Homo-oligomer: A and B are copies of this chain.
Amino acid sequence: RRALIVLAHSERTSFNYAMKEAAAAALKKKGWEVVESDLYAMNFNPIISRKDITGKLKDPANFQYPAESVLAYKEGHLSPDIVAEQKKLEAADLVIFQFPLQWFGVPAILKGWFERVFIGEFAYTYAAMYDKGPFRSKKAVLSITTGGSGSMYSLQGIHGDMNVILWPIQSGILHFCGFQVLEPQLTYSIGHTPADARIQILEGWKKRLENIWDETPLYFAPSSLFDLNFQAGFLMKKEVQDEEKNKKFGLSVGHHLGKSIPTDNQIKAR
């Protein structure tokens, strides 16, 4: 197989870059082909503009980025940095996102990466979303490093559930394009962690990569539970809503239905 490792960190000296080195090494030792996207190292511009389109614009007087970039994608007039990335995504089976958690989401340079690269039709259409998305043959995993401890991010922690903070990312950005999201690698307290524990964290990550492809992905509501048309408002099917009135838990984090979230829905599989 072949994997794509995307890293968002400015320092080669960091544990994030050390986590990338371990992941790249362990996967190569298993016969994977590993290609890298170190956004700071690539001089990556993370800002969507009319400059993502190479040549003449169709309608410059009222520039409309989603419509304009799709045409640019179909016509082959996207900027060479955007092109090179999209080639790597189709080529790869596994995508690992290695980044420091920053302000309760992905870093800005990675946030713009999605915006300039996950272009309409290439990555998603309203005709084929979530289970039906373009990347459904691919698996993607977040490896996150935080300042705060897992206790701060537990249900009773001051920051609130970590499952709710992962939900926009694993559901909205990854799964929406069809990715099967694997259990994230959550490395809490990085920075206040002793060098003997960082060694075991790097080794434990390499050990999980030896069978990453065989793991169960996180659970998301399959799109078949919904009437996927503009006239039904993309709501749940009435039959599906009936069968849920006597169920104790919700389905997912975003689909809690005003019910209890299944525990570690964004963190633990099965």
Contacts and interface: CB of A to CB of B under 8 A. Distances in A.
Nearest to A39: B47
Nearest to A241: B156
Interface stretch (A28-36, A79-87, A107-115): A107-115
Interface residues of A, number: 73
Contacts of A167: 160, 164-165
A160 to B, nearest CB: 2
A208 interface: no
A104 B173 contact: yes
Interface of A: 10-11, 13, 40, 46-50, 61-66, 102-109, 111-112, 114-115, 118, 129-130, 147-149, 151-152, 154-161, 164-165, 167-169, 171-173, 176, 191, 223, 226, 228, 230, 233-236, 241, 252-261, 263
A247 to B, nearest CB: 12
Contact of A158 (B104, B111, B234): B234
B236 A156 contact: yes
Given A158-B129, A172-B159, A108 B112 contact: yes
A256 B252 contact: no
